[PDB]
């Protein structure tokens, strides 16, 4: 009902947050603009829900209308968008170079830095810019806490063939997903490292069978754990994925240490975080983990998913738990509200540890006498009889 109009000069961005209680609708009415790398269509009404934090940027200039109550809304004039564009340009240069030398292996890029420096946002911008160049990069998500590919407690990778949806983010077209089972790597650091090594190995063999994926390269998002044992995760991730480029966002000490340790062929670039990045408390982060899990089963406002609830006999499945090796679980009251991954491993053995998963279900009830559990499931029947425990819980 309330309306706000904004004139954006070239290289400026409108930053706003929808109110606690209401939606905010955004409309580009003149010029060109993009939201984290996805182009906006002239005069299309993009409805953002409450709490949404959004930045619309323009290279040449724009006029933009907001309809609805906003908590905040302003035009910033000095972003690092050019920096983030030049990273894409230099990445596409390496591709051409290696195409002209040739199948060409695309460049691989690791984004690092502490919490709330914009690693996820920059990874999104770079993926989008690659797609708009006509490339299909692989997006690799190592953040088991704040995960934009699958549920929390996963390490995942997806081939990006379309720009992110402005409101909903990227389409998850058949991701490779590994069940780590915890919201931080420190819960079991050696399993975490084993998982991204198996991810790296799987991706290298798969890109051999798909040339477009191969030359698309990789954009690898890490978590904000940069201190202590988080630092060694970074070095081992760089090594395991054989990255060509490390982008450090807003941590000059991390930059300095990485400069001294990484192999000489690795190009390291320090860039600042955007002034629009917002700090998020642990309470907000937990809420976002819950909404991620919710979305996995139910989808979005734009694209609803319709999950099934049904009963499963304990005589038809084997529950197991990593942690470090495999252990067979007895159906218990304490599995209630937990996610379980459907393992691609047919037996509950050593294969389970480094096997990707089909997907997840949520245990909603446990009937011990009847020896049944109620599960929420994206499909009608279980895709596997080997269900692997995750410590991620969700009340629905
Ligand atoms: N330029 C920007 N304008 C407004 N909000 C932003 C901008 N960049 C990032 N954000 C927001 O800041 C928060 C942190 O960004 P994120 O990329 O998730 O940090 P990190 O991945 O490093 O933990 C996110 O909620 C994101 O929507
Ligand atoms: F990716 Al973060 F805090 F570093 F969500
Ligand atoms: Mg992130």
Swiss-Prot record:
GO MF entry, a single one: polynucleotide 5'-hydroxyl-kinase activity
Chief localisation class: nucleus
Subcellular locations according to the entry: Nucleus
Any single biological process term in GO: mRNA 3'-end processing
Functional note: Required for endonucleolytic cleavage during polyadenylation-dependent pre-mRNA 3'-end formation.
Alphabetical list of HAMAP family matching this protein: Clp1
The family this protein is said to belong to: Belongs to the Clp1 family. Clp1 subfamily.
Protein name: Protein clpf-1
Protein species of origin: Caenorhabditis elegans
């Amino acid at each position: 009902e309330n309306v706000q109009e904004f004139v954006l000069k070239e290289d400026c961005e409108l930053r706003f947050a929808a109110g606690d209680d209401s939606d905010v609708c955004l409309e580009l009415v003149k010029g060109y603009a993009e939201i984290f790398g996805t182009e906006l269509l002239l005069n299309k009404k993009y409805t953002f829900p409450a709490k949404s934090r959004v930045a619309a940027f323009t290279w040449k200039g724009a006029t933009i209308e907001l309809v609805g109550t906003t908590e905040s809304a302003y035009v910033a004039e000095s972003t690092p968008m050019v920096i983030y564009l030049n990273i894409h340009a230099a990445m596409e240069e390496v591709r051409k170079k290696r195409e002209e030398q040739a199948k060409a292996k695309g460049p691989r890029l690791l984004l690092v830095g502490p919490t709330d420096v914009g690693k996820t946002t920059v990874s999104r911008i770079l993926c989008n810019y690659s797609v708009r160049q006509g490339r299909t990069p692989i997006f690799v998500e190592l953040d088991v806490g704040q995960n934009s590919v699958s549920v929390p407690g996963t390490v995942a990778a997806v081939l990006v063939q379309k720009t992110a949806d402005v409101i909903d983010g990227f389409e998850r077209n058949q991701p490779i997903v590994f069940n780590f089972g915890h919201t931080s790597p420190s819960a079991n650091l050696s399993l975490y490292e084993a998982l991204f090594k198996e991810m790296a190995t799987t991706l290298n063999a798969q890109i051999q069978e798909n040339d477009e994926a191969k030359i698309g390269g990789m954009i690898i998002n890490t978590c904000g754990w940069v201190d202590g044992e988080g630092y060694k995760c970074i070095v081992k991730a760089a090594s395991a994925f054989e990255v060509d480029v490390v982008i450090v966002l807003d941590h000059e000490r991390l930059y300095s240490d990485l400069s001294k340790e990484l192999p000489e062929f690795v190009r390291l670039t320090h860039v600042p975080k955007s002034g629009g990045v917002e700090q998020r408390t642990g309470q907000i982060r937990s809420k976002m983990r819950g909404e991620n899990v919710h979305r996995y089963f139910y989808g979005t406002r734009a694209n609803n998913l319709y999950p099934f609830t049904f009963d499963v006999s304990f005589d038809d499945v084997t529950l197991c738990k990593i942690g470090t090796k495999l252990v067979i679980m007895e159906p218990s009251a304490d599995i209630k509200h937990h996610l379980f991954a459907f393992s691609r491993s047919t037996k509950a053995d050593e294969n389970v540890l480094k096997s990707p998963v089909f997907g997840f279900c949520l245990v909603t009830e446990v009937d011990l006498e009847k020896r049944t559990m109620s599960i929420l499931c994206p499909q009608r029947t279980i895709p596997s009889k080997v269900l692997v425990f995750s410590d991620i819980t969700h009340l629905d």
